[PDB]
Amino acid sequence: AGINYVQNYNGNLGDFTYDESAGTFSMYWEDGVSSDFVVGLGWTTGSSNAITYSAEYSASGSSSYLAVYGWVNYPQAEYYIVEDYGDYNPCSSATSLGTVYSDGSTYQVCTDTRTNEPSITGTSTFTQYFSVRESTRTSGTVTVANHFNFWAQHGFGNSDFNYQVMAVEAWSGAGSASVTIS
């Protein structure tokens, strides 16, 4: 996949292993976590190219996501295309933007504003964009373009991309995850 970036945000909170060249990574937090971590493999500059992945993901009792994750520099935005998740749906609370259909399923799409929080610039106010898969899965292709195009109708800059990775995130509870990016 031309993986050239390792995402490790508090990976030390659980057990994070990875092989850039194989496009694989695992992450165990079986003892539970009480703080947020985001780990994964990807690219230093994001693009609208499709991402194919395969995963073993077990996070039923955990506030966790198995998602395509990345940032946009300006307007600053953090984004997720959540394929599978734990006990928490971000669109349950956020402002609804509609629905989008892609790769065999509809995704609820929502947005939210984070004030003075950890960001690719340290601490700041940024916008989040979420596409949550209606029929969750742990393997398949994500045609990122379909999501970027829909979000772009609502403010998503759709250019000036920072990093983008296939990620696993959790900030409560315990779980397990093994992922391969093809």
Curated annotation (Swiss-Prot):
Pathway(s) annotated for this protein in UniProt: Glycan degradation; xylan degradation
One GO-annotated biological process of the protein: xylan catabolic process
Record's keyword annotation contains Transcription: no
Predominant localisation class: secreted
Keywords of this entry: Carbohydrate metabolism, Disulfide bond, Glycosidase, Hydrolase, Polysaccharide degradation, Secreted, Signal, Xylan degradation
Family matches, as InterPro entries: ConA-like_dom_sf (IPR013320), GH11/12 (IPR013319), GH11_AS_1 (IPR018208), GH11_AS_2 (IPR033119), GH11_dom (IPR033123), Glyco_hydro_11 (IPR001137)
Location(s), subcellular: Secreted
Catalytic reaction equation(s): Endohydrolysis of (1->4)-beta-D-xylosidic linkages in xylans
Gene Ontology molecular functions: endo-1,4-beta-xylanase activity
Record's GO cellular component terms: extracellular region
Active site: 78, 169
Highest taxon of source: Eukaryota
Annotated S-S bridges: 91-110
Domain GH11: 1-182
EC nos: 3.2.1.8
UniProt enzyme class: hydrolase
SUPFAM superfamilies in the cross-refs: Concanavalin A-like lectins/glucanases
Family from the record: Belongs to the glycosyl hydrolase 11 (cellulase G) family.
PANTHER family, A to Z: ENDO-1,4-BETA-XYLANASE A-RELATED
Protein name (Swiss-Prot/TrEMBL): Endo-1,4-beta-xylanase 3
Species: Aspergillus kawachii (strain NBRC 4308) (White koji mold)
